Design an enzyme around this catalytic site. Sequence first.
Site, PDB file in Angstrom:
ATOM      1  N   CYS A   1       0.826  -1.202   0.000  1.00  0.00           N
ATOM      2  CA  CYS A   1       0.000   0.000   0.000  1.00  0.00           C
ATOM      3  C   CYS A   1       0.863   1.256   0.000  1.00  0.00           C
ATOM      4  O   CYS A   1       0.593   2.206  -0.745  1.00  0.00           O
ATOM      5  CB  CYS A   1      -0.947  -0.016   1.204  1.00  0.00           C
ATOM      6  SG  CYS A   1      -0.142  -0.017   2.835  1.00  0.00           S
TER       7      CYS A   1
ATOM      8  N   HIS B   1       0.571   5.906   9.418  1.00  0.00           N
ATOM      9  CA  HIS B   1      -0.232   4.823   8.872  1.00  0.00           C
ATOM     10  C   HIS B   1      -1.463   4.580   9.733  1.00  0.00           C
ATOM     11  O   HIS B   1      -1.393   4.610  10.965  1.00  0.00           O
ATOM     12  CB  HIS B   1       0.597   3.541   8.778  1.00  0.00           C
ATOM     13  CG  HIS B   1       0.241   2.676   7.612  1.00  0.00           C
ATOM     14  ND1 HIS B   1      -0.874   1.864   7.600  1.00  0.00           N
ATOM     15  CD2 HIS B   1       0.851   2.494   6.416  1.00  0.00           C
ATOM     16  CE1 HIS B   1      -0.934   1.220   6.449  1.00  0.00           C
ATOM     17  NE2 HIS B   1       0.099   1.586   5.712  1.00  0.00           N
TER      18      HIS B   1
END
Length: 329
Positions: free
Chosen positions: A148, A175
Amino acid sequence: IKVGINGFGRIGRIVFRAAQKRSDIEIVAINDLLDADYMAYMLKYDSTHGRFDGTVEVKDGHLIVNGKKIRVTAERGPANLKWDEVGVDVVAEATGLFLTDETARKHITAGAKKVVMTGPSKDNTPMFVKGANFDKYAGQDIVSNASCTTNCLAPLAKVINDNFGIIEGLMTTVHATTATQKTVDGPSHKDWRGGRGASQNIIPSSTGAAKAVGKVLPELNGKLTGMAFRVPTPNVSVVDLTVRLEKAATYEQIKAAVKAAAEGEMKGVLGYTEDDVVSTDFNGEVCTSVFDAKAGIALNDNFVKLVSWYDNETGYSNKVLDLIAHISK
Ligand SMILES: [Ag+]
Ligand SMILES: [Ag+]
């Protein structure tokens, strides 16, 4: 044009939802360790992306979404997946357990034609990130779409390196919480910080995204490294890239360079905004990298700090579909 999904996790279900809105790809088969009525529930309701926009029904152990019937398996031995029965061309492998060539090849053993791994490889299966190195696909039968975070860092770093040249870079991603963390303090022997309560902590974590970019863009090999902070937010993350530039460039020149890529060669992959956005404003964003013009800072013409948002579920899932379509062309 016909795809089978192995693993119905966060990534698997969002890949399924995004495929419904497409004309080139039709999913026909799904595999996981769960019943069919349970999968219908997990697909119908989502805390992050809302209710499913369509029909879901269970008929004789199989799923019927928008009138099309999906075959539902449950076998944990990929060889007997009988991919050739319903005849699938590409398999999107999202267990997180077969990120190796040996394990992934059990799928084309079972009658598929190609395999895309929804995670970074642990051997040297090639990796591909859109806008970064889709050009250099060489017809392999097993590929990876990286992480990602790598899908967000690489397109931005290519634009910066090709216009101004990167001498060195350090990045940090704030994150969002993932399924690998815990609600309260729990056991986690590989990463002791990761076992701590996610709802109450800023959790430092290691990451391989910055060095992974060195493989999809060999120019920046060994020129970047990174680090992460996990924070109690359900979705959407942000990358903070500190780099030194070989050629001097004002901040407005950097804005104009990124803006040109987002409207030019990298439209749909790289995004650009000058607004007072926050993380929720990118819930469901399709671009894997949205440059935040107003949040970046520059100390001088050669030392700059760039920030860019990414939905770590939606944008990544949309790009593995683009990778599937690109390897069947
Ligand atoms: Ag966009
Ligand atoms: Ag977009």
